């Protein structure tokens, strides 16, 4: 029957996906699709194949953003979900959680991740467990669950650093670690990890990783209120993203948002509006409603003083389960209004900061 022959090739396929080896991953994708052709109707093997195709696509889109094959692969994967068991059930929940995170579906992604976490003792490969620990630490950071994100990211970075050639994941883990130290107001303890990632990103010549390193470095200077140095980090990050075929990635909007916020705080009103312009039009073109709403908040704050639109956006982001952006944006409004000596409305946004922090603290 040679059902294990397809089984071993799909596992090898997964190994090359984690190594970010597109040539090897494409070779084995073709090998599996030729073996699948002359094979009995094994529903678990076909579901295993469909899951790895979904994982293979997640790697490609990460390296080449969409100018949707993901949706068709998701439909076939969600056609047989009963009678699942063993490591295949782990792969199903874990991969679905990865997809939900890409769709800003945080509550669904957490739920999928926690189901995959229950079957972690079925994962003998330490590298595969490092993939899980990194991905669960990533979403915990975006939830500003710092202690849980640190608990998982240390387990991931140690397993990755034990092996070699997982350098891409090593850069990404350096992002998570430093960004956790940043959330704890330790920018001095975060710049080492980001400069570490920037160095190794320049070695493998990974343009978006270089830009993400510049973006995370600019977030440190922003925390230190080194707005000039922060804007320069943001500028070069937008430059490397655009100069290497990443100007259509949703993640460049994060850099545009901070650069708009930074130049506004530098009292460079004129330059700031043209930055908020480019960011909000690009958010509309990429159909990213969440990033567009964040640019609306910046425009309503520094340009319009439309506090009702500010409140509705903060309420929108809370229903989006993005309480950290609720805190960051309400903190932006509180400082600006307190600087403008409008202490009446500045109190109300300081209260919203306190509200978001308590909600973040509630956790589960």
């Amino acid at each position: 029957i040679s059902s294990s022959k397809v089984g071993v090739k799909i596992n090898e396929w997964y190994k090359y996906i984690r190594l970010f080896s597109v040539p090897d991953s494409e070779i084995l994708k073709a090998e599996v699709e030729e073996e699948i052709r002359h094979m009995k109707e094994d529903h678990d093997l076909l579901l295993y194949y469909s899951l790895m195709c979904f994982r293979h696509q997640l790697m490609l889109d990460y390296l080449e953003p969409k100018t949707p094959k993901i949706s068709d692969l998701l439909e076939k994967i969600e056609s047989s979900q009963t009678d699942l068991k063993g490591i295949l059930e782990y792969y199903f929940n874990f991969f679905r959680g990865m997809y939900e995170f890409e769709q800003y579906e945080y509550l669904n992604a957490i739920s999928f991740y926690k189901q995959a976490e229950r079957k972690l003792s079925l994962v003998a490969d330490e590298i595969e467990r490092a993939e899980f620990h990194y991905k669960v630490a990533e979403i915990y950071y975006h939830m500003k669950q710092t202690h849980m994100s640190m608990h998982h990211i240390v387990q991931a970075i140690d397993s990755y650093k034990a092996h070699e050639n997982y350098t891409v994941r090593v850069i990404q883990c350096s992002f998570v670690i430093g960004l956790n130290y940043l959330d704890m107001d330790y920018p001095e303890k975060a710049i080492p990890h980001f400069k570490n990632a920037l160095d190794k990103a320049r070695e493998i010549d990974m343009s978006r990783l270089i830009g993400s390193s510049l973006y995370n470095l600019g977030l440190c200077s922003f925390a230190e209120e080194a707005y000039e140095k922060a804007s320069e980090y943001f500028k070069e990050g937008i430059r490397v993203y655009q100069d290497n075929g990443y100007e259509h990635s949703n993640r460049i909007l994060d850099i545009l948002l901070m650069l708009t916020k930074t130049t506004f705080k530098m009292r460079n009103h004129s330059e700031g509006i043209s930055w908020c312009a480019h960011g909000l039009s690009l958010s509309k073109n990429l159909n990213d409603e969440i990033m567009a709403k964040m640019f609306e908040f910046i425009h309503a704050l520094y340009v319009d003083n439309d506090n009702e639109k500010l409140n509705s956006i903060l309420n929108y982001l809370e229903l989006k389960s993005m309480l950290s952006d609720v805190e960051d944006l309400a903190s932006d409004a509180a400082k600006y209004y307190n600087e403008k000596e409008d202490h009446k409305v500045a109190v109300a946004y300081y209260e919203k900061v306190l509200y978001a922090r308590k909600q973040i603290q509630r956790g589960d």
């Binding site: 990533e138 950071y141 975006h142 850069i171 990404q172 992002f175 998570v176 430093g178 960004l179 940043l182 978006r208 990783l209 993400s212 973006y215 995370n216 977030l219 993640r251 994060d254 948002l257 901070m258 916020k261 964040m294 950290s324 952006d325 960051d328």
Partner: peptide, 6 residues
């Protein structure tokens, strides 16, 4: 804003 976890 959240940093890039890539």
């Amino acid at each position: 804003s959240r940093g890039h976890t890539s």
